[PDB]
Amino acid sequence: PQITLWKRPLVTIRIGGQLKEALLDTGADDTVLEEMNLPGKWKPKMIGGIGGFIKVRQYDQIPIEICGHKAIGTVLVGPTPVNIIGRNLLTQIGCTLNF
Amino acid sequence: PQITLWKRPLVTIRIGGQLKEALLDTGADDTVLEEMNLPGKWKPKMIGGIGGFIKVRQYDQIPIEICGHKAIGTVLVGPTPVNIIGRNLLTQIGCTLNF
Numbered sequence: 001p002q003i004t005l006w007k008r009p010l011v012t013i014r015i016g017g018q019l020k021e022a023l024l025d026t027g028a029d030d031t032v033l034e035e036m037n038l039p040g041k042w043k044p045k046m047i048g049g050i051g052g053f054i055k056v057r058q059y060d061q062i063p064i065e066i067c068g069h070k071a072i073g074t075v076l077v078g079p080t081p082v083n084i085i086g087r088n089l090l091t092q093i094g095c096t097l098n099f
Numbered sequence: 100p101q102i103t104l105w106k107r108p109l110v111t112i113r114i115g116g117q118l119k120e121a122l123l124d125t126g127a128d129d130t131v132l133e134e135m136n137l138p139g140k141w142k143p144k145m146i147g148g149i150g151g152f153i154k155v156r157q158y159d160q161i162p163i164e165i166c167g168h169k170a171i172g173t174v175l176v177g178p179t180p181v182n183i184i185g186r187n188l189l190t191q192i193g194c195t196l197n198f
């Protein structure tokens with residue numbers, strides 16, 4: 001799709017069999033989802049943004065369908081203000097910025 | 100132009116006499132610039148992201164050129180680690196996400 005930006009670019013994602021809403025975030029290096037259970041091993045990680053750093057759980061090689069497009073990659077889980085799809089997965093689904 | 104997301108989507112902006120590098124950020128509602136002593140009236144604001152909230156100064160109707168495209172609107176100024184072009188200005192330069 002072509003998505004304009006007069007509203008937040010929120011899309012439905014499917015992960016671990018569940019539907020969620022998530023923000024397509026070109027200013028995010030990584031994908032960070034609100035607290036949830038995901039299967040498999042994870043490792044502790046810290047990530048930072050505008051207000052400082054937070055602790056997250058890093059799950060590698062997780063499948064996620066974003067607005068109908070398949071990705072499989074690293075998903076961070078922790079106290080993010082909103083579910084965020086970052087560049088690691090935006091690149092996988094062929095997302096570009098255009099003007 | 101088309102901008103891929105393999106790397107941070109940094110572009111050159113002009114506001115004042117300072118050319119700066121800023122992120123084209125679809126995850127940002129508002130535009131947030133690194134500390135700079137802009138002239139004019141402002142209002143205090145708090146904005147929140149990963150790690151919590153920071154205090155910024157809200158300046159209105161500020162001309163900013165983004166990649167040679169003229170925009171004018173609200174810019175938030177404070178202790179962000181990166182200059183952030185938000186949706187309020189991305190819409191004005193006709194920027195979309197595409198996949």
Ligand SMILES: CC[C@H](C)[C@H](NC(C)=O)C(=O)N[C@@H](Cc1ccccc1)[C@H](O)CN(CC(C)C)S(=O)(=O)c1ccc(OC)cc1
Pocket residue numbers: 025026027028029030031032047048049050051081082084086124126127128129130131146147148149180181183185
């Ligand atoms: C991967 C971790 C994290 C998500 C990301 N950090 C990095 C290093 O990519 C980030 O915070 N990304 C930021 C941009 C960024 C990048 C690097 C360092 C600091 C910030 C994000 O794109 C915009 N922000 C709003 C979001 C959190 C809903 S925001 O910046 O917090 C924000 C919040 C409110 C705004 O206006 C209301 C505008 C912007």
